[PDB]
Design a protein around this ligand. Structure first.
Ligand SMILES: Nc1nc2c(ncn2[C@@H]2O[C@H](COP(=O)(O)OP(=O)(O)O)[C@@H](O)[C@H]2O)c(=O)[nH]1
Ligand SMILES: [Mg+2]
Ligand SMILES: [Mg+2]
Ligand SMILES: [Mg+2]
Ligand SMILES: [Mg+2]
Ligand SMILES: [Mg+2]
Ligand SMILES: [Mg+2]
Ligand SMILES: [Mg+2]
Lengths: 85, 62, 122, 697
RNA sequence: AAAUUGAAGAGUUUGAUCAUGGCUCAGAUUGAACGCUGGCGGCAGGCCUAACACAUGCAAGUCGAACGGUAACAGGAAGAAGCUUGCUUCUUUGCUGACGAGUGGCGGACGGGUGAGUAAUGUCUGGGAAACUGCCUGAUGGAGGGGGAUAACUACUGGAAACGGUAGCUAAUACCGCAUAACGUCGCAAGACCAAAGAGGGGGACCUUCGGGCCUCUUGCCAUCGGAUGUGCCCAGAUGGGAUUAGCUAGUAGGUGGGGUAACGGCUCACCUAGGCGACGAUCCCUAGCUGGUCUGAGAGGAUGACCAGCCACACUGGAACUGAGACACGGUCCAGACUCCUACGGGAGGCAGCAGUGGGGAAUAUUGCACAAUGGGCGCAAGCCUGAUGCAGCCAUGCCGCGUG
RNA sequence: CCCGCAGAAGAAGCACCGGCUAACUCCGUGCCAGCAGCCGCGGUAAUACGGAGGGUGCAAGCGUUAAUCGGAAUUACUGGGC
C-alpha cells in the first residue's frame, strides 16, 4: 500500500486464486485415486491413476508443484495399487 | 548517595540539579563521590588561579 | 438502568477494566442512569500501566445497558452487558483515546462527539 | 527571488483593548481567496500549498491584498495580530518595534480604554506610524465621531477621520470616504467579499462635506508648499491628498481612523486599502540605527534593501506544538538562504540557520529564502531571546532594544507531587525563555521559588501551561515574607556559663554580656561586638570564640527562629579554665547568655518596609491612598506631577502580595507600583508564632 | 634473507625486623564524558541509554525492442484558413519518436538497519547424504497449435479518500487445450504421461489478400543432462554462570505402515514397544547474538565482540500464509492486539531497529546536505532511469599523525 | 598540488612541585578555611591549604571521572599455599 509495486498484491491474489483452483483439481483427482484404492479394486484405481497422471505432470511442468512432488505421488500411488489388486 | 562539595564556597541547595563524579574522600567514611564544580548549577570557586580546571573556574584573560 | 453499586465494564482505553457506580448524578433522589447519563464511578480494577489506578473516583458516561434504549418508533436496542466511558472529573473529556463495542444514537451529543467519533459503530 | 517587489511590503500589526475585534479582523483580513486561481506574479505563487498540504493557523501571517475594487498588484501585507492584556504585554512590546505600522483597532461603543492608552504608550516608545480602525459599529450605543474625539482628548493625538459612518447598529451598511467622495456599501448579502461604490449619498452629504473639508486642511498643513497652494483656493488631487497625508504619517504626525464592522464585514475591506495607502513600507520607514560590541556607535544603519549582509531581528521564541523551537525572525536587511551561519551577537554564540518557515493563508509554508522586511520563523537549537539581533558575521552586533518590563506581581509556586520540583524547575526554565516578561526566583529565606510575572492572569495562564505543556501540576502561594527579629530598647546585663566537667576532659566557658540595641541600620555589619574583657579574664584567644558563637545565633534568633540584626554586644566579664575552656565553650556560653538575655531584653519581630511609588490618574488618588492605609502602610508625601499623581508610602511587604491586580481594580488599569525594601518595624502578629513549628521547628 | 628480542618496581601495618597479607601508584588502551583552554590539515570514529514514540522529506524501480492503447513535446501525414504567397501563428491524425495510466516481465528475498530474541532450530572448527537453485554458463533437441477470458477503455455507477461495482470483444511473451516428445517422470519389466512464445533488425525480385513464411542475424521460450553459485539438512568437538536448581520428558525415545517435504527425519498420523536424557550436570533459573578479530600481557592467560568482514536473528507486538527459483517477506498481504492520525462521522490510514531529522532518556554521540562522476546493484538490446548502497561534503580536538605560533 | 607574501603577522595553554614522583621559596591562614591516588598536611616559618614568584612535565591539548589487562607469583595451567 506504500510503493506502486503494490500491484504485486493484486497480481499475487489473482495468481493465488488460479493456483488454488489448479491445486484443488489436482488433489481432487489424487483423492479420486486414493478413494478408489480404499474401495478395493485394481481396475478402478488404475483408471483414476491414468486420469490423474497427466494432471500431475502438467502441474509439475507448469510451476504449480515440483517435479519431485508429482513423482512421489505417482510412486506411492502405483505402489499402493500394485499391492492392492 | 552522598557526595563531597570541594572548594571554598558553594551555592548548592535542596533542589539544585548537579553533576556528580567519582572519587572517595578518605576523610568521610561513606562519601564515595564528588561534585564537578562549574557544571550543572555548581558554580566555580571564587577566583581560584591554581588548579583552575579542577574546581571549574574560567580564566582571566589578562 | 444503572444505579449505585452497579458493576459496569469499560468501553474505552482509559486503563480501567471494571468500575462501580457510586452515585447517579443529576437531581435529588435520582435512581437510574440511562445510556446518555453521566454518573460517578469508583474504579474496582485496572491494568498495570493504565492511565487510571484502581480505587480512583471519577465520573463516567454510560454507553451500553442490558435494559437498552428505546427509539421514537418504539424499537428497543438492548446490549449484552453494561459499559461506560470514563471521563475526567472536571471537564468530561473522556480519559481514553480508543473505544470498544458499539454505542447508540442517544449519545450523539455536543459533548460526546468525541465518543461518537471514536466509536466503531452508531 | 524577492519577486514580490520588496519596496511594496507593508509590515504592520493591529492592537487594541481586549475583545475589541483584533482577532475578528485578523480573521476577516484573511479572506483572500486566491484558491483555484493564483492571484500573484502578474510563474509560482504561494498557490501550490493553497492546496492545504499542512493545515494550521499561526502568528504573524502574510497576505496578498490587491485592493477593494481599486487595485494595484500583489502586496504581501505582513500582519502580526496583537493581544490586549497588560498581563501579557511583552507580546505587544516586541511586536511594536518589529512593526513598521500599526492598525489601532477600537470599539465604537467602548471607545478608548486602559489597554488602548497602554498600547498607545507602547507605540509612542517606538514612534510607530499608526492608523486606527474603529470596529463595532453595529452595537447599540456605538458612534464613530465620539470615539474619534476621544482619541483627540484622551491620548493627545490628531485623529484625522479619513472615513465616515453610514448609520449605526442595523443602519450600518457603508462608509463615506472623504477622497473618493463615494460610500461603498458592500454586498454582505451574497458575500462581504463582493463590493460596490455609490455616488454622493444624501444622508451624510452635509456632515461629510464639513468633515471632508477638515481632511483637506490636514493634507494642506502637511506640506509647506501645499499650505500656500491650499491658500490658492485650489483643491487637491488623488495623489497630493494621500501622498501629503502619507508622507508624514510615516513620521508620527496624525493617526488615520476608519470605521467598520468585522462582524458584518464592512469597513474592513476598505481598511486594508488604507494600510497600503498610508501605512509605511520598510523602504518608507526611516532606516534602522545600529551599533557594534565595542564601538560606542558604529552607525550601522542597515539599508533595508537586502544588499547589506544578512541582518535580522528575532522577536519571539515559540513552544511549537511539534518542532519545539520556531523562533520567529524579522529580517530587516540582508538575505539568509536555506542554510547559512550567523552568531548570537547579543549572546556571543554561533550556529547555522536551517529551516525558515513563513505561514500564509493559514498553511504553514516552508521557505528556503527570507529577505528584506520578510517576516518568518526559524527552527534551531541555540536560543535567541526576544529582541535579540541576528546580524551577519559582519556584525552590526547590538540593536538598541535592551528593554523588558519588570514583573509587577510575584507569587510563590510549588508542585503537587514533591518530586516534580526538578520538573517544575525545568518547566519554568523553558517558560522563562519563551517570554522575557516572566521571571523565576530563588529567595534566600527559603529555597521557595517565586514566579514573578506581569499580571495576575499573565502568571495564571502559566500555572496551567505547565498543566498543559509539561504535564506537571503546581500549587501557588503567597511568598513568605522575611521576618527578622531584634531587641528593642531594653539593655540587659546577663550571664552565661557552660560547663560540663564530670570527666577528664570537660568544657568550661563563661560570659557576662550587656546586650543593648543599636540604631536600626547605623552600621554596615549591623552586629556589634566590643570586648571589654580585661585581666585576661577570658583568655583573649577565645574572644573571637565568643563573637563567632554570638553572630552564629544572630542567624537563628531565639524568639521565633528567624534572623537577628541591629543589636550591640559588650563582653563585660567572663571566666575560663585552661584545661577545659575551649573554642566550643565560649561559643556555647555566649550562645546560652544570648538566649537567656534575649528572653528578657524585650525582643520584637520586624517586617520589611518597602518604598512604594504609584503612578496613578488624579481621580483615583483618594482610592489608592485609602487602600495603602488599609494595608498597614504609612504614606509619606504625594506630589502630583501632571497626568498622574505620585504617591509615596513605605508600606510593609506582607501587605503587598497581590497589590497591582487590586490597584488596577482601583485605578481602572491605569496605574502601576514600584516597591523597594527600605527598613524594618513591628506590628503585633503571632502569625509568626503560628509559623514556627509547621516548618523546621 | 627477515616474519620477531622476551619478563623491572614503589608507597602503606612496626619503636625498628622478617614474613604473610590487602589497599594505592608508576604503563598501555578507549565509540569516551566533564572542567579549563583552543591554530590548521590529513585519516578514521561518532546513541554504549528508551528494540522508547515518531512530524516531515527521500531510501525499488525498470522494460513501447511483450500488449492493448495515446495525456503531451514533437515528428510523419490530411491539410483546410490570415494566404507575409502556404515563414503555412490555424484545424484533424498513435501513422512514428515517445509516453500518462493499465495487463504482462524481471526485480522488489539483493543492498541498507538494529542485537530485542537465542545458551542452542544460533556461531566456530571438520566432515557427511537424503537435496533443491532466478539471472550466469556447456551441450542435446524442440518451438505443432485452438480460443476462452480480463485490465485500461466505453458506458452507467458508488464514495471525501483507499478503492470499487455492472455488461462489451479487447489484445498479448498474460491463461488453458488439442498437437508431439525423451540418455525426462513413474513403473522391476511390460508400459503410460509431461512443454513451448514471440518479438526487433533487415532479407532487390525470389510475396504482395498489400509487413511472403519457414530457413537472415540477434535475443526471447520449452525440455532434459552437466558446471558454477546460492540455499536447505545432518553429525562430532568447542561454544557462560548457578546444585541456595536432581531428576526431567508422553510424539516423549524408538518400530512398522499411511501421509508430508525439494530432501532424510516423530516432519506428521494411527497402531506397537517403554523407552529416551541426567552428576561428563538433564530440567529449572540468570545472562548473552556468534566468529575472524580489538585491548592488555613476556607468555599462559584476562577482558572484550564499538568500526571492518562472515554467519544467525528480528522488523510496532502475536500468528498465519500467499506470490515466488528463493520469504513464511523493514519500506507486501490477512487477522488479532496496543498506539496514533484524518473524517464531508457514514469510513479510512500508518508502522524510521533505511538516510537525515523531532520529542524523550542520558554524563554523552552529527546535516531534515551534494551526486549518481567512478564502484556496485535492479531493469533494459542498449542508450538511459532508479539506487539516503556508495562516493563525497557538513558538525564534533572524539582519537592517531604531521605542521604551525617565528 | 604549483608560482606571485608586502608582513612575524593571525595562532599557548593545562596539571603538578611533602614521599612514592620530577619540580622550592615567600606571604595569609592557624586541626579553621581547605587538600588528599595511598601514606598524610593544616593548632603561628605550612616546601602538603589559598595566593605570588620560580620551576617541572606535557603541549592543541592538559587534568579529573569512569572502564579493561598488567604490575597481582592477590585464583599460582606456566606459577601459590594450609
Ligand atoms: N457586535 C459586534 N461584535 C463584534 C464586531 N466585531 C467583532 N465583534 C465581536 O467581538 C468579539 C471579539 O473577539 P476577539 O476578536 O477575540 O477580540 P480580540 O481578542 O480583542 O480581538 C468577537 O466575538 C466578535 O464577535 C462588531 O462589529 N460588532
Ligand atoms: Mg512508460
Ligand atoms: Mg526392472
Ligand atoms: Mg540433505
Ligand atoms: Mg519503536
Ligand atoms: Mg521502515
Ligand atoms: Mg599548594
Ligand atoms: Mg599466598
Amino acid at each position: 500500500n506504500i510503493k506502486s509495486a503494490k500491484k504485486r498484491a493484486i497480481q499475487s491474489e489473482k495468481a493465488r486464486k488460479h493456483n488454488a483452483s489448479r491445486r484443488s483439481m489436482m488433489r481432487t483427482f489424487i483423492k479420486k485415486v486414493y478413494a478408489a484404492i480404499e474401495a478395493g479394486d485394481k481396475a478402478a484405481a488404475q483408471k483414476a491413476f491414468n486420469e490423474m497422471q497427466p494432471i500431475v505432470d502438467r502441474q509439475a511442468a507448469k510451476g504449480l508443484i515440483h517435479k519431485n512432488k508429482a513423482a512421489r505421488h505417482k510412486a506411492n500411488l502405483t505402489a499402493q495399487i500394485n499391492k492392492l489388486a | 548517595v552522598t557526595s563531597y562539595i570541594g572548594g571554598e564556597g558553594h551555592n548548592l541547595q535542596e533542589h539544585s540539579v548537579i553533576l556528580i563524579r567519582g572519587g572517595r574522600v578518605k576523610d568521610l567514611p561513606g562519601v564515595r563521590y564528588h561534585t564537578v564544580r562549574g557544571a550543572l548549577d555548581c558554580s566555580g570557586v571564587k577566583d581560584r588561579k591554581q588548579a583552575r580546571s579542577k574546581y571549574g573556574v574560567k580564566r582571566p584573560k589578562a | 438502568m444503572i444505579q449505585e453499586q452497579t458493576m459496569l465494564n469499560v468501553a474505552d482505553n482509559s486503563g480501567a477494566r471494571r468500575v462501580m457506580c457510586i452515585k447517579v448524578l443529576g437531581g435529588s433522589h435520582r435512581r437510574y442512569a440511562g445510556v446518555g447519563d453521566i454518573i460517578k464511578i469508583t474504579i474496582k480494577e485496572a491494568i498495570p500501566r493504565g492511565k487510571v489506578k484502581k480505587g480512583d473516583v471519577l465520573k463516567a458516561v454510560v454507553v451500553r445497558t442490558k435494559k437498552g434504549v428505546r427509539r421514537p418508533d418504539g424499537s428497543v436496542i438492548r446490549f449484552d452487558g453494561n459499559a461506560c466511558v470514563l471521563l475526567n472529573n472536571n471537564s468530561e473529556q473522556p480519559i481514553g483515546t480508543r473505544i470498544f463495542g458499539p454505542v447508540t444514537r442517544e449519545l450523539r451529543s455536543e459533548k460526546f462527539m468525541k465518543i461518537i467519533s471514536l466509536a466503531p459503530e452508531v | 527571488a524577492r519577486t514580490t517587489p520588496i519596496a511594496r511590503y507593508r509590515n504592520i500589526g493591529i492592537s487594541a483593548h481586549i475583545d475589541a475585534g483584533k482577532t475578528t479582523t485578523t480573521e476577516r483580513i484573511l479572506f483572500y481567496t486566491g484558491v483555484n486561481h493564483k492571484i500573484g506574479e502578474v510563474m509560482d505563487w504561494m498557490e501550490q500549498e493553497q492546496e492545504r498540504g499542512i493545515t494550521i493557523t499561526s502568528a504573524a501571517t502574510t497576505a496578498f491584498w490587491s485592493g477593494m475594487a481599486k487595485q494595484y498588484e500583489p502586496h504581501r501585507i505582513n500582519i502580526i495580530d496583537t493581544p490586549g492584556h497588560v498581563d501579557f504585554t511583552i507580546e505587544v512590546e516586541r511586536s511594536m518595534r518589529v512593526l513598521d505600522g500599526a492598525v489601532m483597532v477600537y470599539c465604537a461603543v467602548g471607545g478608548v480604554q486602559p489597554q488602548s492608552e497602554t498600547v498607545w504608550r507602547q507605540a509612542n516608545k517606538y514612534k510607530v506610524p499608526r492608523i486606527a480602525f474603529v470596529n463595532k459599529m453595529d452595537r447599540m450605543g456605538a458612534n464613530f465621531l465620539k470615539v474619534v474625539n476621544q482619541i483627540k482628548t484622551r491620548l493627545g493625538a490628531n485623529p484625522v477621520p479619513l472615513q465616515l459612518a453610514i448609520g449605526a447598529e442595523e443602519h450600518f451598511t457603508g462608509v463615506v470616504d472623504l477622497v473618493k467622495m463615494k460610500a461603498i456599501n458592500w454586498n454582505d448579502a451574497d458575500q462581504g467579499v463582493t463590493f460596490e461604490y455609490e455616488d454622493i449619498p444624501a444622508d451624510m452629504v452635509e456632515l461629510a462635506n464639513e468633515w471632508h473639508q477638515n481632511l483637506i486642511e490636514s493634507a494642506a498643513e502637511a506640506s509647506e508648499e501645499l499650505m500656500e497652494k491650499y491658500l490658492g483656493g485650489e483643491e487637491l488631487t488623488e495623489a497630493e491628498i494621500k501622498g501629503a497625508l502619507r508622507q508624514r504619517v510615516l513620521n508620527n504626525e496624525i493617526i488615520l481612523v476608519t470605521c467598520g464592522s468585522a462582524f458584518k464585514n464592512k469597513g474592513v475591506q476598505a481598511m486594508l486599502d488604507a494600510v497600503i495607502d498610508y501605512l509605511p513600507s520598510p523602504v518608507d520607514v526611516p532606516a534602522i540605527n545600529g551599533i557594534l560590541d565595542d564601538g560606542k556607535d558604529t552607525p550601522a544603519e542597515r539599508h533595508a534593501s537586502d544588499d547589506e549582509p544578512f541582518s535580522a531581528l528575532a522577536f519571539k521564541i515559540a513552544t511549537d506544538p511539534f518542532v519545539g523551537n520556531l523562533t520567529f525572525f524579522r529580517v530587516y536587511s540582508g538575505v539568509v538562504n536555506s542554510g547559512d551561519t550567523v552568531l548570537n551577537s547579543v549572546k556571543a554564540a554561533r550556529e547555522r540557520f536551517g529551516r525558515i518557515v513563513q505561514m500564509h493563508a493559514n498553511k504553514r509554508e516552508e521557505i528556503k529564502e527570507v529577505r528584506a522586511g520578510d517576516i518568518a520563523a526559524a527552527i534551531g537549537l541555540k536560543d535567541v531571546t526576544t529582541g535579540d539581533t541576528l546580524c551577519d558575521p559582519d556584525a552590526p552586533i547590538i540593536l538598541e532594544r535592551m528593554e523588558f518590563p519588570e514583573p509587577v506581581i510575584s507569587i510563590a509556586v510549588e508542585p503537587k507531587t514533591k518530586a516534580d520540583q526538578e520538573k517544575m524547575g525545568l518547566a519554568l526554565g523553558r517558560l522563562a525563555k519563551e517570554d522575557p516578561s516572566f521571571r523565576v526566583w530563588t529567595d534566600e529565606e527559603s529555597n521557595q521559588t517565586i514566579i514573578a510575572g506581569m499580571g495576575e492572569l499573565h502568571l495564571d495562564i502559566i500555572v496551567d501551561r505547565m498543566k498543559r505543556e509539561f504535564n506537571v501540576e503546581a500549587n501557588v502561594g503567597k511568598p513568605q515574607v522575611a521576618y527578622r527579629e531584634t531587641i528593642r530598647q531594653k539593655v540587659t546585663d546577663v550571664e552565661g556559663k557552660h560547663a560540663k566537667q564530670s570527666g577528664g576532659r570537660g568544657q568550661y566557658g563563661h560570659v557576662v554580656i550587656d546586650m543593648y540595641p543599636l540604631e536600626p541600620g547605623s552600621n554596615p555589619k549591623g552586629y556589634e561586638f566590643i570586648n571589654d574583657i580585661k585581666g585576661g579574664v577570658i583568655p583573649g584567644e577565645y574572644i573571637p570564640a565568643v563573637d563567632k558563637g554570638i553572630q552564629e545565633q544572630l542567624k537563628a534568633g531565639p524568639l521565633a527562629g528567624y534572623p537577628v540584626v541591629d543589636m550591640g554586644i559588650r563582653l563585660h566579664f567572663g571566666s575560663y579554665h585552661d584545661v577545659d575552656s575551649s573554642e566550643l565553650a565560649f561559643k556555647l556560653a555566649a550562645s546560652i547568655a544570648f538566649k537567656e538575655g534575649f528572653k528578657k531584653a524585650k525582643p520584637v519581630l520586624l517586617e520589611p518596609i518597602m518604598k512604594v511609588e504609584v503612578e496613578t490618574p488624579e481621580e483615583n488618588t483618594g482610592d489608592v491612598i485609602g487602600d495603602l492605609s488599609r494595608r498597614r502602610g504609612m504614606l509619606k508625601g504625594q506630589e502630583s506631577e501632571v497626568t498622574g499623581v505620585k504617591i509615596h508610602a513605605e508600606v510593609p511587604l506582607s501587605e503587598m502580595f497581590g497589590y497591582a491586580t487590586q490597584l488596577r481594580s482601583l485605578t481602572k488599569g491605569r496605574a502601576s507600583y514600584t516597591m523597594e525594601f527600605l527598613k524594618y518595624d513591628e506590628a503585633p502578629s503571632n502569625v509568626a508564632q503560628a509559623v514556627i513549628e509547621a516548618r523546621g521547628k
